[PDB]
């Protein structure tokens with residue numbers, strides 16, 4: 001397919017996007033981040049394939065960055081396809097404990113590190129992880145980047161180009177709006193929200209997601 | 220997945236819709252028609268799977284209709300997945316000659332009947348087939364239903380919910396707008412346009428498709 005794209009979206013923050021080209025629909029995209037702490041790089045969600053993960057690692061190496069770890073924000077392949085490769089390179093991989101268990105239940109490679117806590121931090125205080133409750137999946141977490149004022153909402157949040165919730169096979173639709181409201185309750189001074197699929201937007205992605213969740217739940 | 224849906228959209232015309240549920244995106248739909256001439260039924264595009272084709276044939280049998288033939292509007296699986304089943308039941312299957320050759324090149328079941336003509340008619344004059352030129356694929360054809368004033372645009376036309384051309388792996392983007400203009404030149408008194416994917420709309424689907432094609436071609 002179309003290979004990995006990596007673009008800068010803030011000082012020390014890059015959006016990585018990988019793709020699948022589906023007959024019947026067309027190109028589907030999948031986003032994660034690279035977050036820098038000086039020269040130390042943290043991967044928030046792997047690309048959607050092992051090959052695209054290799055491209056992301058090469059992207060870092062070519063530019064002199066040192067990849068420290070990855071965190072995956074739920075167990076789906078579009079968040080985790082690269083865990084196997086990172087493990088083979090002795091790069092620490094993280095998920096929540098529930099995500100780890102879900103991966104093992106799917107017969108997929110597990111992270112080398114995991115936490116059973118609603119909050120966890122990577123780097124300085126560079127990346128603040130939070131579990132707001134079930135939505136897109138039972139295990140979805142989000143990441144707040146206090147320096148850049150970016151919330152990585154992952155697949156729990158929906159870009160404005162979408163008029164529905166996306167893939168809901170593993171979703172808890174009746175809990176989804178409440179889980180977004182829990183994010184809102186954190187009172188992050190959000191300047192940008194990055195979704196797992198679709199275009200980056202502003203804080204109103206949260207409101208849009210609540211609208212979509214409440215509509216689908218009442219249906 | 221979610222099984223076949225069949226709903227009436229005009230006197231003697233039914234929309235059949237089949238689905239695939241994709242992680243990373245969600246539910247993708249695929250449309251065809253059943254067109255009646257008294258009790259004689261014509262299938263414009265098969266459902267997206269053999270199993271959904273069996274459901275469509277059962278739908279017809281249960282309601283007393285006699286399925287006479289199918290026509291597929293290009294070679295992609297979402298138009299043709301049911302050809303094998305119809306052939307096994309000695310129900311005539313049609314495509315254009317180019318579509319037939321493309322199917323054989325993909326190692327897929329071929330229709331039992333085919334024409335190398337820009338126009339062809341099924342039933343009364345019930346269904347008027349036209350090849351307007353390359354767009355979504357090299358072989359795409361459309362169907363005009365003069366009694367119901369419906370143009371089945373198939374995957375060559377794009378519903379208003381889409382802001383792009385969809386799957387373009389086999390497309391001729393530089394010819395697409397011209398091909399729509401050829402449809403316009405037929406001067407069909409169009410009341411409804413049915414796309415291969417997405418929601419049924421009005422004649423302005425043609426204009427929308429031209430806009431999308433011209434934008435993509437200039438890019």
Ligand SMILES: [Zn+2]
Pocket residue numbers: 074076136137155243
């Ligand atoms: Zn997911």
Ligand SMILES: [Zn+2]
Pocket residue numbers: 030076078079155196197243
């Ligand atoms: Zn996702």
Ligand SMILES: [Zn+2]
Pocket residue numbers: 024293295355356374
């Ligand atoms: Zn097609």
Ligand SMILES: [Zn+2]
Pocket residue numbers: 024249295297298374415416
């Ligand atoms: Zn199609």
